[PDB]
Amino acid sequence: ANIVGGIEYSINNASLCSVGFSVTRGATKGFVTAGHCGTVNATARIGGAVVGTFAARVFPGNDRAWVSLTSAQTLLPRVANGSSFVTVRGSTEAAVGAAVCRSGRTTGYQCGTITAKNVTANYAEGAVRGLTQGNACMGRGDSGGSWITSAGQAQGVMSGGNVQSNGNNCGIPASQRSSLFERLQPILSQYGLSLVTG
């Protein structure tokens, strides 16, 4: 499969999540995603085919993971924006107030701004600390997917947010949304990963 930020994958033939970003770990191909999407050794599929397995995760506390892919997968420095793409150019972290977008299999490509940092989410499984908040909308299944600026700076992976009864927070105003992502930089250093860029 072609590995593009925001696309769907399944975990053990069950849950769905979204790809974060293509990465390498030496010779090993991978993608980063959210930790709550899978347990170590869980099987990832795209397009009906096995693409790899969860190599490592931290969730709760943090919310991060990477999927170790077979060599047949095609890593790409891209995030889905409808039928087109945003090129991944680097991992410079944006400040509060910056515009940012996110990509995932439920709500597609959505944009807003970064409103706060170091936010705690109290999820069913426990607290997750250190999350960045934006007001782009999101929904169930967008977890794991890319957060990126239009200029191509990869920010993090979708963790959670204040979804409403319809499964998303797109039906409430931006001022009322809390959409939370796990910062990319600590994921990259904790697992020794390099971002695929273009």
My answer on whether 145 and 48 are in the same domain is: no
Q: Which one-letter DSSP state was computed for residue 61?
A: B
CA atoms within 13 A on the CB side of 52: 27
What gap in Å lies between CA 40 and CA 188, rounded to an integer? 17
Q: How many CB atoms are closer than 10 A to CB 126? A: 10
Do 91 and 71 belong together in one domain? no
Provide the 8-state DSSP code for 150: T
Calculate the alpha carbon distances from 107 to 2, 55, 118 in Å.
Answer: 20, 27, 25
Domain CATH for 177: 2.40.10.10
Co-location of 108 and 178 in the same domain:
yes
Catalytic site residue from 10, 22, 103, 143: 143
Q: Same structural domain for residues 83 and 177?
A: yes
Q: Does residue 160 share a domain with residue 127?
A: yes
Strands (E), 82-153: 84-87, 99-104, 108-123, 126-134, 146-148
Write the residues followed by a gap in the chain (C–N more than 2.5 A).
none
Distance of CA 187 to the CA centre of its chain: 11
Q: State which amino acid sits at residue 124.
A: A
Q: Both 66 and 114 in a single domain?
A: no
Q: How many domains does the chain have?
A: 2
Active site residue 63: yes
Strand pairing report for 74-81 and 2-5: parallel
Catalytic residue among 10, 18, 63, 142: 63
Whether residues 51 and 83 fall in one domain: no
Number of other residues whose CB lies within 10 A of the CB of residue 105: 20
What does the alpha-carbon distance between residue 159 and residue 142 come to, in Å, rounded to a whole number?
A: 9
Residue 135 and residue 146 share a domain: yes
191 is in which domain, residue-wise?
Answer: 3-76+184-196
Q: Is 36 a catalytic residue?
A: yes
Which of the residues 36, 68, 159, 178 is marked catalytic?
36
* 170-197 burial: b if 16+ Cβ within 10 Å, else e: beeebeebbbbbbbbeebbeebebebbe
End-to-end CA distance of the chain: 19
Please say whether the beta carbons of 55 and 44 come within 8 A. no
Residue closest to 121 by CA, chosen among 157, 159, 95, 90? 159
Statement to judge: residues 145 and 176 lie in one domain: yes
Only one residue has tokens 């974060």, namely 20
Please confirm, yes or no, whether 142 is among the known catalytic residues.
no
User: Does residue 38 share a domain with residue 92?
Assistant: no
Rounded-to-integer distance, Cα 138 and Cα 146, Å: 11
Same domain as 123, residue 35: no
